Amino acid sequence: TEFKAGSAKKGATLFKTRCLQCHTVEKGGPHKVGPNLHGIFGRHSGQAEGYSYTDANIKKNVLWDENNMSEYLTNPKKYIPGTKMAWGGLKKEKDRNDLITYLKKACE
Amino acid sequence: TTPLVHVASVEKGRSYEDFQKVYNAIALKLREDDEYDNYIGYGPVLVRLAWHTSGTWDKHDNTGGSYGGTYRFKKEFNDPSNAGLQNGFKFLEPIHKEFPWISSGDLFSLGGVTAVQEMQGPKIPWRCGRVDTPEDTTPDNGRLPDADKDADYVRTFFQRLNMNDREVVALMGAHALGKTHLKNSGYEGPWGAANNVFTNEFYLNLLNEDWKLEKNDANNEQWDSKSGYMMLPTDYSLIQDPKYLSIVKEYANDQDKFFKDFSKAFEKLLENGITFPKDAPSPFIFKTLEEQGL
Numbered sequence: 001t002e003f004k005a006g007s008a009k010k011g012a013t014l015f016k017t018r019c020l021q022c023h024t025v026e027k028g029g030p031h032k033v034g035p036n037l038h039g040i041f042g043r044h045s046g047q048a049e050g051y052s053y054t055d056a057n058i059k060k061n062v063l064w065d066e067n068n069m070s071e072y073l074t075n076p077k078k079y080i081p082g083t084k085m086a087w088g089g090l091k092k093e094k095d096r097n098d099l100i101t102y103l104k105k106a107c108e
Numbered sequence: 109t110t111p112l113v114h115v116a117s118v119e120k121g122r123s124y125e126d127f128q129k130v131y132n133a134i135a136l137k138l139r140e141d142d143e144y145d146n147y148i149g150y151g152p153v154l155v156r157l158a159w160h161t162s163g164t165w166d167k168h169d170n171t172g173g174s175y176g177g178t179y180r181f182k183k184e185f186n187d188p189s190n191a192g193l194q195n196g197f198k199f200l201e202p203i204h205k206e207f208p209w210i211s212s213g214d215l216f217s218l219g220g221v222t223a224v225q226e227m228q229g230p231k232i233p234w235r236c237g238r239v240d241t242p243e244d245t246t247p248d249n250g251r252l253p254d255a256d257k258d259a260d261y262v263r264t265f266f267q268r269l270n271m272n273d274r275e276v277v278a279l280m281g282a283h284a285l286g287k288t289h290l291k292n293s294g295y296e297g298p299w300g301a302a303n304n305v306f307t308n309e310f311y312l313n314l315l316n317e318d319w320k321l322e323k324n325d326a327n328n329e330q331w332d333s334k335s336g337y338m339m340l341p342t343d344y345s346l347i348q349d350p351k352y353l354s355i356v357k358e359y360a361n362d363q364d365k366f367f368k369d370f371s372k373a374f375e376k377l378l379e380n381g382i383t384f385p386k387d388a389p390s391p392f393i394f395k396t397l398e399e400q401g402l
């Protein structure tokens with residue numbers, strides 16, 4: 001596709017250092033600062049039950065595919081204005097590919 | 109004889125655009141070397157640098173402070189409470205070679221200002237004019253604060269920096285950034301989850317989490333939470349003291365109030381002990397990388 005595909009093991013260290021403080025990826029996993037991301041691909045934004053999202057994340061209503069997700073992790077506040085995901089952003093494309101390929105694996 | 113008067117002298121023929129290019133150099137390098145400290149980046153160590161070199165000020169005889177740029181000297185560089193800031197100085201030196209005209213004080217304080225703005229924080233006004241001073245003006249070790257203390261200590265310590273109750277609570281909110289390293293200070297773990305984005309989480313975590321006093325692997329006593337976070341004895345002293353508690357709740361509810369309060373307090377911290385003439389330019393507000401389209 002437009003996004004390539006990288007290393008799944010490099011993307012594991014990227015998640016563990018940069019996403020795991022707030023997110024879990026396994027089946028039936030608990031909601032921490034952020035929601036459980038299992039089954040995030042092919043699902044619409046703001047649909048994980050049991051978690052309280054902002055009105056902006058639900059109103060955006062985009063089906064999470066590998067491309068719009070790469071756009072989101074670049075700059076969260078520019079993609080979904082008003083989101084409470086306190087995150088800087090993955091500015092390097094290699095790091096975006098590496099993490100999306102690991103997330104693809106970890107979340108079904 | 110009165111204290112020493114440190115008059116701000118702007119570096120020969122330099123203006124806003126020359127300093128914007130130094131800011132831009134620190135900001136891009138911050139974006140480039142984002143691998144540092146398990147991906148936290150160099151953002152937090154730089155604000156800590158800007159504070160530890162300004163934090164040696166003593167209002168009574170005007171010794172210490174950011175002006176001198178005295179952190180480049182071995183006595184202040186090897187101060188036990190300055191452990192870990194070598195990494196911050198090492199990040200700053202290649203850009204000191206690219207811009208040899210800028211004084212050390214101006215560079216360390218600029219790095220802090222750059223670090224906070226780039227981490228989505230408030231825009232903090234910065235003034236130039238600090239001048240390098242000799243090896244003999246270098247402050248003796250022991251002027252920085254200890255972590256294993258109470259509210260009475262914090263209040264008396266910050267009086268030396270001319271900071272009131274509101275200023276200290278705001279400044280302490282910078283602890284929303286980074287972590288404590290056992291190898292450096294004897295304490296371990298983060299204060300929050302967003303360790304490289306400037307937010308008011310420090311205050312929300314202080315009163316919304318369940319804290320238990322435990323012992324770490326350096327035998328020091330720190331407050332831990334079930335969610336994996338930590339607080340220093342000086343940090344939790346902010347909810348034990350009734351006067352500090354009120355301001356903490358105010359910052360936990362209103363981030364914009366924290367943002368505006370941090371900026372005036374931090375600018376005051378960086379500028380402490382410096383006398384700016386009437387002819388000197390009005391403070392610089394720099395354009396972030398995101399504001400330049402990057």
Ligand code: ZNH
Nearest residue numbers: 018019022033034045046047053054057083084085301302
């Ligand atoms: C790490 C690199 C991270 C991601 C991968 C990632 C992804 C992610 C997605 C796809 C969502 C949308 C969820 C939905 O079902 O619509 C989302 C949401 C929220 N997140 Zn994150 N995220 C990564 C990291 C972080 C970090 C470091 C934090 C912790 C401070 C964080 C937090 C949250 C959060 C509170 C979310 C809800 C957003 C909303 O407005 O409701 N994320 N993430």
Ligand code: ZNH
Nearest residue numbers: 152153156159253254255279282286287288289292293342
């Ligand atoms: C009382 C008082 C006080 C005290 C005791 C302290 C202490 C501290 C300690 C111990 C540490 C750790 C180190 C290591 O590495 O290990 C830190 C860090 C710190 N810090 Zn902080 N602080 C303080 C204040 C402060 C202020 C005021 C500021 C600013 C504004 C700061 C900023 C800081 C930072 C940002 C950090 C992080 C860094 C990193 O991570 O690198 N800080 N501290």
